[PDB]
Design a protein around this nucleic acid. Structure first.
Ligand code: ZN
Ligand code: ZN
Lengths: 172, 24, 103, 58, 440, 229, 96, 45, 93, 83, 36, 306, 47, 69
RNA sequence: AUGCGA
């Protein structure tokens, strides 16, 4: 997760060669899909990207206290000047090349420095499978709990759903 | 309200690959 | 040691008997070899169609399909591509060495 | 209660340990603060419980 | 495979097993997630392995995804491409999208492997370039022609369709015509493709292919499209940033100028609901006492909220309709933020106005901000402040931030929304089960 | 007040009052205000909005209205609110640095991130509350790009080489109590002793358990392995 | 009208079935337990609510379950009668 | 020589099946089982 | 029907919220099942599901052996339970 | 219960559910060593084999369509229009 | 060829088709009205 | 028409900078598939030598054994990777490790206190002994042949000063690391390059000239040396488009944004290769091109199977 | 230069922990409402 | 925990430049930009790697139970 | 149940 509650699982550990590489010669640490933002409006995260990029280049901490800024002193302007003085796109995008092919992408890609945090919910641990296991003596049905390697419940709603399909041999 | 000040050492710290402040 | 029996395989599902369309499967390859190889293959005027495709990244597989006309065989056209790639590497090494020489 | 960070580290503790919680059977538990009516001051309330007392209750 | 909230039978389907090397997590195609109402945020799924040919045949023929192209609720397709694939179709299908013989053929094998049985031809077929001259050039629309020509059975004529987009023609110019979706014998001749077309385009292209050749083809088309868009997003990608968010000096001038008018709006409505003369002083003592009578009435207070809401909401309509598709620093065919909402990849024009224009008046349970019994809506507000802001009308926007009083109100709206979200589902389980027992 | 709260001047000094500082302007000094009196008090949120003859106090800083975590969240005033609340749930549920005396605690579980960094972007209360003592994350180079086709909706991609360099590497501690007094039992015995006697045990257990019956600290243990004898 | 307010599309066939089921007795037979009482499957009654109450009324009636309720049939571990269980399959076998 | 460190005195000792579980230098009743020179293989990842 | 939180009787055993019927009859735990957090994969068919090899090695189908599946099952046996297209058990006739 | 052949009135077409059950049961039969009446043609999945048998209607099964009264119609596969 | 199949579970189909979309939700409207 | 020799006529190299740690050179008139091929290969396919199996006998440090082992993996060694062949896996550990396939590094450090440093906060290096564990503690352990073979190339960390671990008196680390041959594709620790990247040459097409103080006023919009003005009464020229960073700052101003277009030269490539010290970056490039050629020879050599 | 890093101050504090007063007195003040509450059961008015 | 060996993003070894950088902020009383520039950290991936580090091990080590204290 | 993932 970012410090903005825009949480995601790692879908894949992309090969470094296949990542997109910037004209600075780097390939990002994390790629977050832009299509998450139009609903979430996590625009504070956009500003953290442009601030962490500026702040890494000039090498100083940035204050992110709420309402330190103003509608007439937007952060995009502050870090726009800071970043542009650095030698970087005033809007902060950078022309990146395809890892796979190598062409320059249609447009300049938005790259920056964002604090990401690893949630304790390493859902790695939540996997479970049972093809055989203990059964409760009062039912001869799979016992309960992960450490008993017990089996997930086919609830009433799942019963209903299998009846919906007409799949009576699957429901039985 | 006073606007937060811009940094005083706001100066070029990035170059193309191939270059340095030896061209600055 | 063995004449490699497993690098490339000829996908019967994708090959005419007349003679010029095939899908080849190469193990342990990707765009690395792929995009250069399709590029040089596309330099062949006798290629009608050629391209490469990854069945799936985790699978570490490369299928490259060549359909040409009756003026070349896909085995020959591919081998001709590969001879081009080796000669190209000769160009790269030779000119690179040469510019090292200019110093 | 009165140990400086230096001594606190000398006692194998987090140099900044705030504390305020309880070690019960080794499991760290704290008592959750609760929001209760402001004391000693009459709060005017309309409640249907008041009718739930019986007839003639408002 | 079965998800969490088994809200409908379409949410528990049979999928064909593909053992993936070096995985530890269940891999799922995006096209199914709008049927499970699933999202990789952390959602967990149950995988059931049936042990019986009766259950196998049902899980391959009845519960299978292909039998679920339409919902029984309405019969609108619930299965289509999503997010990035939508923006990829909008970008690829632009008349601006050109492709070389090399590029064209590469994208094609990128999306179709006949060796995988992805075709009914066992060879490849191809189109002549759009441009014979200034270099052999193929359009993206020609690519959709080639793929459709390759996925449909050669014994059948190409699909003929006149559909529309979710993108008004006005965005591509004064004479441009790009909402007209034109399909002639399997060949896309005009327009782009979007939510209206693939993913869940009721009457759209995918739905039409489902009708003409059936569900098996429609699935084949979906997988082919998924590769097409993956490869083209590999070549061109998609991004979004602050450059996509700024307005012009013009848009800021209109925005600030329209927002100059709410200052009267607050009290002007306050004097109508109080039923007092025009321009009645914001400090009339009788006005203030009348408004205290109004505070003591929940119903009259409802009238005051609703009227102020309608008026400032009309100011909102002014703000967006004026500033919108004109005051942005960069427009559509480049503004990705606009692109995603206008294509309907994600977002709505409401979100775009909330970032770029204003949040506007927050509401609760159907009406304006709660007010303390003292007549104050926030510590900082004098009793009965008639300012629209004091009612919760947020003029600040996420791009330029919100004043703290507005952050305190937007917290109200966000919470009470999440509360309703958490209770509506508890009162809807009983709605399902109460009659599901009866009609079973 | 007409139909208002019943009038009076109720002072309170007793326990459990919630109290918060605001700046009293007429004496330009800090004053402690509670929630009861606040109802009728005009507190300007900043000095420029102090309205004449109205605001008697002003907030010292509008951060005074946020909890600790809300100030730790950068630009929380720029995002949709429920994203800030989910930020409280993520950062609060985040695997980070729990302490440094972990070799002297014994929780049933601890999660300790080895690669910790200090945010470049922070509130000044990040330093003022010292959360820098226990950094919970890392500053990453992020490209906001759908590009690979696996970054949709809620899924994000990492560089493999980054993990190979140790990015987000984390550790999980599980503490165990091995008791020999399950039944403690009446008390005619209590003899169980770690070790051996019959020799007949599989001597391959020494590959894990020392001749005292306890495993060699440092030992790799796999499901099935003996944890003690 | 309720669905139209939220601009929801709902097949008229669904609502039309639902209405007919609410009127199956010529009355306004709701979908709670009260309406189920008049249904014939005592187990389906058991398997919704007030299970013991349905038990009492069933036993006192000396009721016989005709094993029609899909739920009830689940209780007895029987091929469900719906759909693929709506019928039986037999085999043609050579006699010579 | 097996080793056990006093949790509060650091004093090394060599417990026996015939001795009290106590640090002979401090008197504490908590003893860490010492690490020794013992081979462990590692995949450098 | 008696005269603080006493041990439940058969009426309490049968109803409350599940009613033995709801908690162990109208829904049950089941074998041959797995649960996991899902990850996207666009290169597979839209009708397939990507199974991780842990779950691919821990889930079995009870295959009656014939002359037509003897080769495949003979190989799966060769692999054994701890390999790909393998098999964990053999049930005699 | 015997619906006379002269009186059979139901859909001449195989329902999706009927076809599904047929394919399952026949597949299951071949998988339990029922004699296959069609060329195995290389196949090893009994289910796809039963699909081949459906394509030739070689299947020797009969559908008993019940009517809620309990009367039923015995239909051969070889007549009900499969699809 | 578009007719509903004999044996289709149309009752259940109806019921879910009324429940599921009701999750997205002067006189009583919405869920309280449907409940009413 | 196309032949490989017409490319050879058209292909050019210009070497900008050749340091034993960095090479910045340009490839004019090549194909992107090939440059990206070399870059990609330089990253993943060029073999390097790295610690792989660390055998601890003791680690009393406050640092986790596994983590420290990974760090030893991360340490780049100044070793010519041609000194070793690949090690198979089909075979037993006794055959796995030989002087032909393995490099042994021993590390045995015992931390102590020092005999009494002045005040109290002297740098732990003054107060303690071996408080800083550096790469300089990687003891090289040759065998026979390679003992002689490394007479003039002993195994050294490319930065002995890398702090590896910090100890305390009585803490001790005893481990024996097995360094093998590996490729950067299998793990980033085996990548011999720190950064191997290419960038297309920025092209600045000035549509109409700008002059005077608008010409220098435009010049300050680009990196100092991108835009050259000789007189400005007549032109503002591009001294070197290679100096530009494509900050696109000029686009903020219409004074210019209407008389210039900014594109790129697909043929011209700006390579930047920085070496991690294992090998000189150009020599790594030599291996990369010989690698692609060897792969094409492998594909010629392979018999088409079916 | 607005929220500058206390880097030397930190690393000095890591190397040589405080011997007289914790930094971050808000950190001690945050659980003050608990600890003070518990002290009023053992120290305070009357006892 | 301890200064990372390499910059995750780039790959440049950085573990050698920790002690020198901290020395440059103390001994040379330099500023963060100039010190990191003298270290050759001319990319912001390289910049962030060392710049953000929090060498928490110094706090850990005072807890060493293997020496009396 | 307390808390929590969705
Ligand atoms: Zn002691
Ligand atoms: Zn770096």
């Amino acid at each position: 997760s970012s410090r903005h509650g825009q949480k995601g699982v790692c879908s894949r550990k992309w090969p470094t060669i296949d990542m997109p590489f910037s004209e600075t010669g780097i390939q990002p640490d994390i790629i977050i899909n832009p299509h998450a933002f139009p609903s979430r409006m996590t625009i504070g995260m956009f500003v953290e990207s442009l601030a962490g990029k500026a702040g890494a280049l000039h090498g100083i901490a940035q204050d992110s206290t709420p309402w330190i800024f103003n509608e007439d002193d937007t952060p995009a302007d502050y870090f726009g000047e800071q970043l542009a003085k650095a030698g970087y796109n005033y809007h902060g995008n950078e022309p990146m090349y395809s890892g796979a092919t190598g062409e320059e992408l249609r447009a300049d890609i938005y790259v920056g420095v964002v604090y990401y945090q690893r949630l304790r919910h390493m859902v790695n641990d939540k996997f479970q499978v049972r093809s055989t296991g203990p059964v409760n003596s009062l039912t001869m049905q799979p016992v309960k709990g992960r450490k008993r390697h017990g089996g997930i419940r086919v609830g009433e709603m799942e019963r209903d759903a299998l009846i919906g399909h007409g799949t009576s041999f699957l429901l039985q | 309200r006073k606007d937060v000040p811009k940094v005083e050492g706001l100066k070029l710290e990035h170059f193309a690959t191939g270059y340095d402040a030896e061209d600055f | 040691e063995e004449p490699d029996r497993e690098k490339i395989k000829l996908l019967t599902q994708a090959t005419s008997e007349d003679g010029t369309s095939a899908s080849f499967q190469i193990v342990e390859e990707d765009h690395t070899l792929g995009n250069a190889l399709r590029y040089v293959i596309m330099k062949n005027p006798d290629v009608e169609f050629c391209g490469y495709s990854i069945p799936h990244p985790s699978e570490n597989l490369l299928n490259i399909r060549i359909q040409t006309y009756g003026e070349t065989t896909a085995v020959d056209a591919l081998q001709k591509g590969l001879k081009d790639l080796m000669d190209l590497c000769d160009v790269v090494e030779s000119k690179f060495t040469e510019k090292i020489k200019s110093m | 209660n009165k140990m400086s960070p230096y001594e606190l580290v000398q006692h194998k503790e987090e140099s900044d340990e705030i504390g305020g919680y309880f070690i019960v059977n080794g499991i760290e538990k704290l008592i959750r603060m609760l929001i209760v009516q402001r004391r000693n001051h009459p709060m005017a309330i309309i409640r249907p419980s008041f009718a739930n007392r019986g007839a003639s209750y408002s | 495979m079965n998800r969490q909230p088994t809200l409908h039978k379409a949410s528990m389907m049979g999928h064909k097993v593909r053992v993936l090397p070096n995985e530890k997590t269940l891999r799922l195609h995006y096209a199914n997630t709008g049927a499970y109402n699933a999202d990789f945020d952390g959602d967990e799924m149950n995988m059931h392995f049936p042990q019986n040919e009766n259950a196998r045949a049902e899980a391959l023929n009845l519960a299978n995804t292909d039998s679920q192209y339409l919902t029984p609720t309405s019969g609108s397709p619930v299965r289509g491409l999503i997010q990035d694939h939508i923006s990829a179709g909008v970008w690829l299908t632009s008349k601006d999208s050109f492709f070389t013989r090399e590029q064209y053929q590469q994208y094609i094998y990128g999306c179709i492997r006949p060796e995988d049985g992805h075709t009914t031809r066992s060879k490849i077929v191809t189109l002549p370039p759009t441009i014979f001259k200034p270099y052999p050039l193929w359009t993206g629309k020609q690519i959709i022609t080639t793929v459709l020509l390759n996925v449909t059975p050669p014994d059948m004529p190409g699909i003929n369709l006149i559909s529309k987009n979710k993108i008004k023609n006005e965005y591509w110019g004064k004479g441009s015509l790009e909402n007209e979706v034109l399909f002639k014998d399997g060949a896309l001749l005009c327009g782009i493709l979007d939510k209206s077309q693939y993913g869940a385009s009721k009457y759209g292209i995918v739905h039409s292919l489902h009708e003409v050749y059936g569900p098996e083809v429609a699935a084949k088309v979906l997988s082919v499209l998924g590769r097409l868009f993956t490869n083209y997003i590999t070549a061109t990608a998609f991004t979004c940033g602050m450059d996509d968010l700024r307005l012009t000096a013009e848009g800021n001038k209109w925005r600030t100028d329209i927002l100059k008018t709410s200052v009267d709006t607050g009290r002007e409505a306050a004097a109508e609901v109080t039923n007092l003369d025009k321009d009645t002083p914001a400090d009339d003592p009788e006005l203030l006492k009348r408004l205290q009578e109004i505070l003591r009435d929940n119903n009259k207070s409802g009238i005051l909220d609703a009227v102020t809401s309608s008026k400032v909401n009309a100011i909102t309509s002014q703000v967006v309709s004026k500033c919108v598709p004109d005051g942005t620093m960069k427009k559509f065919p480049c503004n990705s933020m606009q692109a995603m909402a206008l294509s309907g990849a994600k977002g709505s024009n409401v979100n775009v106005s909330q970032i770029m224009c204003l949040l506007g008046q927050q509401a609760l349970e159907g009406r304006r901000v709660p007010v303390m019994v003292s007549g104050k809506t926030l510590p900082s507000f004098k009793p009965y402040e008639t300012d629209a802001m004091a009612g919760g009308y947020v003029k600040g926007r996420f791009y330029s931030g919100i004043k703290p009083q507005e952050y305190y109100f937007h917290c109200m709206a966000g919470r009470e929304g999440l509360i309703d979200t958490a209770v509506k589902t508890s009162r809807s389980g009983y709605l399902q089960r109460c009659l599901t027992k009866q009609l079973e | 007040s007409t139909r208002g709260q019943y009038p009076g001047l109720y002072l309170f000094g007793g326990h459990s009052r919630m109290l918060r500082p605001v700046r009293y302007l007429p004496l330009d000094k800090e004053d402690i205000v509670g929630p009861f009196e606040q109802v009728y008090m005009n507190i300007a949120v900043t000095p420029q909005e102090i309205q004449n003859n109205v605001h008697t106090h002003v907030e010292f800083t509008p951060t005074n209205i946020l909890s600790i975590l809300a100030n730790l969240t950068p630009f929380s005033d720029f995002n949709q609110s429920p994203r800030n609340m989910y930020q409280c749930q993520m950062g609060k549920q985040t695997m980070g640095t729990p302490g440094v005396a972990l070799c002297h605690r014994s929780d049933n579980k601890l999660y300790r991130l080895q690669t910790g960094q200090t945010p470049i972007v922070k509130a000044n209360l990040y330093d003022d509350y010292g959360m820098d003592n226990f950094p919970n994350g890392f500053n990453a180079v992020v490209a906001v790009i759908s590009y690979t086709g696996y970054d949709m909706d809620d899924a994000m991609i990492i560089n493999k080489s980054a993990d190979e360099r140790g990015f987000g590497y984390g550790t999980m501690y599980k503490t165990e109590k091995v008791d020999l007094a399950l039944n403690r039992n009446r008390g005619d015995p209590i003899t169980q002793h770690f070790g051996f006697g019959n020799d007949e045990w599989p001597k391959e257990w020494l590959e894990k358990l020392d001749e005292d019956g306890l495993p060699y600290i440092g030992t790799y243990v796999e499901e099935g392995d003996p944890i003690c004898a | 009208n309720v669905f139209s307010r939220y601009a929801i599309s709902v097949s008229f066939r669904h609502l039309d079935l639902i209405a007919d089921m609410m009127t199956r007795q010529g009355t306004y037979l709701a979908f709670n337990r009260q309406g189920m009482e008049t249904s014939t499957s005592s187990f389906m009654k058991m398997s919704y609510e007030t299970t013991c109450q349905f038990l009492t009324k069933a036993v006192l009636d000396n009721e016989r379950e005709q094993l029609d309720s899909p739920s009830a049939r689940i209780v007895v571990g029987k091929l469900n009668n719906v759909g693929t269980g709506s019928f039986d399959v037999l085999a043609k076998v050579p006699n010579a | 020589t097996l080793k056990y460190i006093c949790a509060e005195c650091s004093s090394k000792l060599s417990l026996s099946r015939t001795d009290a579980v106590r640090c002979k230098d401090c008197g504490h009743r908590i003893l860490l089982k010492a690490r020794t020179k013992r081979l462990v293989q590692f995949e450098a990842r | 029907k008696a005269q603080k939180v006493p041990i439940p009787g058969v009426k309490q055993a049968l109803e409350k919220k599940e009613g033995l019927f709801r908690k162990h009859m109208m829904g049950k735990r089941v074998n041959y099942a797995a649960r996991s957090v899902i990850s996207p994969d666009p290169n597979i068919e839209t009708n397939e599901i990507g199974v991780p090899p842990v779950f691919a090695v821990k889930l079995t189908y009870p295959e009656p052996v014939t002359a037509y599946n003897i080769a495949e099952l003979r190989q799966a046996v060769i692999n054994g339970p701890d390999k790909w297209p393998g098999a964990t058990q053999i049930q005699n006739e | 219960k015997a619906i006379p052949k002269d009186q059979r009135a139901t859909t001449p077409y195989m329902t999706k559910y009927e076809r599904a059950r047929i394919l399952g049961t026949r597949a299951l039969q071949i998988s339990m060593n029922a004699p296959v009446f069609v060329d195995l043609e290389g196949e090893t999945d009994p289910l796809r084999i039963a699909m081949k048998e459906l394509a030739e209607k070689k299947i020797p099964l009969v559908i008993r369509r019940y009517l809620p009264d309990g009367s039923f119609e015995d239909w051969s596969v070889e007549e009900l229009i499969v699809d | 060829r578009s007719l509903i199949n004999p044996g289709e579970a149309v009752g259940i189909i109806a019921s879910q088709s009324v429940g599921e979309p009701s999750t997205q939700m002067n006189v009583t409207l919405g869920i309280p009205r449907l409940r009413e | 028409e196309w032949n490989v020799e017409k490319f050879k006529k058209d292909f050019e190299v210009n070497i900008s900078s050749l340091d034993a740690r960095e090479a910045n050179f340009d490839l004019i008139n090549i194909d992107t598939s090939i440059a990206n091929a070399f870059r990609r290969i330089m990253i993943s396919e060029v073999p390097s030598v790295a610690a792989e199996y660390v055998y601890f006998f003791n680690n009393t440090s406050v640092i986790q054994d596994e983590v420290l082992a990974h760090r030893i993996g991360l340490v780049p060694l100044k070793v010519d990777p041609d000194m070793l062949t690949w090690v198979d896996s089909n075979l037993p550990d006794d055959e796995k490790f030989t002087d032909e396939n393995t490099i042994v590094l021993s590390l045995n450090v015992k931390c102590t206190r020092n005999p009494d440093a002045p005040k109290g906060s002297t740098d732990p290096k003054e107060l303690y002994n071996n408080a800083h564990v550096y790469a300089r503690d990687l003891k090289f352990e040759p065998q026979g042949r390679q003992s002689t073979t490394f007479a003039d190339c002993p195994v050294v960390p490319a930065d002995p000063d890398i702090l590896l671990a910090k100890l305390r008196p009585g803490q001790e680390i005893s481990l024996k690391a097995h360094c093998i041959l590996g490729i950067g594709g299998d793990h980033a620790k085996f990548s011999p390059v720190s950064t191997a990247s290419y960038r297309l040459l920025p092209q600045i097409n000035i549509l109409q000239p700008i002059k005077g103080e608008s010409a220098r006023r435009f010049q300050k919009c680009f990196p100092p040396g991108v835009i050259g003005i000789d007189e400005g009464s007549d032109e503002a020229y591009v001294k070197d488009a290679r100096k530009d960073t494509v900050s696109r700052e000029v686009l903020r101003y219409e004074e210019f944004a209407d008389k210039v277009k900014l594109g790129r030269v697909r043929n011209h490539f700006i390579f930047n290769v920085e070496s991690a010290g294992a090998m000189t970056p150009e020599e790594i490039f030599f291996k990369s091109v010989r690698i692609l050629k060897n792969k094409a020879e492998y594909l010629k050599n392979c018999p088409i199977t079916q | 230069r607005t929220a500058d890093f206390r880097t030397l101050e930190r690393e000095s504090r890591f190397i040589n922990p405080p011997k007289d007063k914790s930094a971050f007195p808000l950190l001690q003040e945050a659980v003050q409402p608990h600890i003070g509450s518990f002290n009023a059961l053992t120290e305070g008015p009357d006892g | 925990m301890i200064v990372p060996v390499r910059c995750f993003s780039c790959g440049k070894v950085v573990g050698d430049k920790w002690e020198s950088y901290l020395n440059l902020l103390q001994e040379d009383e330099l500023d963060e930009g100039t010190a990191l520039s003298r270290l050759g950290l001319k990319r912001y991936c390289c910049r962030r790697m060392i710049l953000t580090h929090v060498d928490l091990i110094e706090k850990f080590l005072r807890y060493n139970p293997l020496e009396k204290r």
